[PDB]
């Protein structure tokens, strides 16, 4: 199924995922497209920052949902 990720700086990316995919798997797919290390990705859905060990399903993220991505800035 397809989901979308919108970055804070305005880009919308399309990912191919399965509900069983973990958040860490999703972050790795984002890294494959934009080079962002998973440990610095804040993925937001319905106002919660998603945890690496859970699955898209655990968060009831369905097809064509849009996640929101913020980079954890190091300074």
């Amino acid at each position: 199924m397809q989901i979308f990720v919108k970055t804070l700086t305005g880009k919308t990316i399309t990912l191919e995922v399965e509900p069983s995919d973990t958040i860490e798997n999703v972050k790795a797919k984002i890294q494959d497209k934009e080079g962002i290390p998973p440990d610095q990705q804040r993925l937001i859905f319905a106002g919660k920052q998603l945890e690496d060990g859970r699955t898209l399903s655990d968060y009831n993220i369905q097809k064509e949902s849009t996640l929101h991505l913020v980079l954890r800035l190091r300074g």
Binding site: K6, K11, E34, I44, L71, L73, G75
Partner: protein, 209 residues
């Protein structure tokens, strides 16, 4: 005697450190000393009067901030720093009706949303005064002290051209102008979102004493 006082924010709009010897450390975005020193600046400036903010006080921010940086390296947080070390307390502050925000995360935005953030921050409904914002991008940290009159002290550990460190007294329009010069819009062809986010977004933490 007045003739024996250092220049301070009680009479000037910009005050500069004398000490430059820490600049290779403060300017190194591969280290987090710049953030440690911004946290020391919030600690020290939140309860200062304008006449106390002289070159000697900024020197003390650098000297004491580097000591705490070193102490942290041997052996509630902001970028992995324990705020207790700075006698600071974190206050919740985020863009609530915005899809990039989550409870407990810092305020996330871009240059286009910086003015809105400051409007919220400067509202004593949202945060008490004085309060400081510690604001980061991928390669720089600053501190914005919101003063009792609602104007600002901008502390920049990078200094002008990477040399020394300064504090500027700013109204809102001046602060926006300065942040656009320190956090400039950055672009080049092929830039990935790792760098777009790193250069063109910010996170801001609210702290008080």
């Amino acid at each position: 005697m007045p003739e024996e006082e250092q220049d301070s924010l009680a009479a000037f709009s910009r005050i500069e450190a004398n000490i430059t010897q820490y600049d290779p450390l403060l300017d190194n975005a591969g280290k987090s000393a710049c953030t440690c020193i911004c946290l020391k600046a919030a600690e020290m400036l939140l309860e200062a009067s304008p006449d106390q903010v002289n070159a000697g006080l900024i020197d003390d921010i650098l000297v004491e901030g580097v000591a705490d940086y070193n102490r942290f390296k041997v052996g509630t947080s902001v970028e992995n720093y324990e705020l207790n070390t700075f006698e600071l307390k974190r206050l919740e502050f985020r863009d609530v009706d915005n899809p990039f925000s989550a409870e407990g995360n810092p305020y996330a935005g871009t240059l286009d949303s910086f003015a809105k953030m400051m409007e919220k921050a400067s509202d004593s409904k949202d945060l008490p005064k004085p309060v400081a914002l510690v604001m980061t991008k991928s390669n720089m940290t600053i501190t914005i002290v919101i003063r009792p009159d609602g104007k600002y002290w901008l502390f920049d550990p990078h200094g002008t051209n990477g040399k020394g460190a300064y504090i500027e007294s700013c109204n809102t329009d001046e602060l926006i102008k300065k942040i656009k010069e320190i956090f400039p819009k950055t672009s080049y062809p092929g830039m990935t979102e790792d760098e777009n986010l790193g250069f063109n977004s910010f996170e801001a933490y609210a702290v008080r004493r």
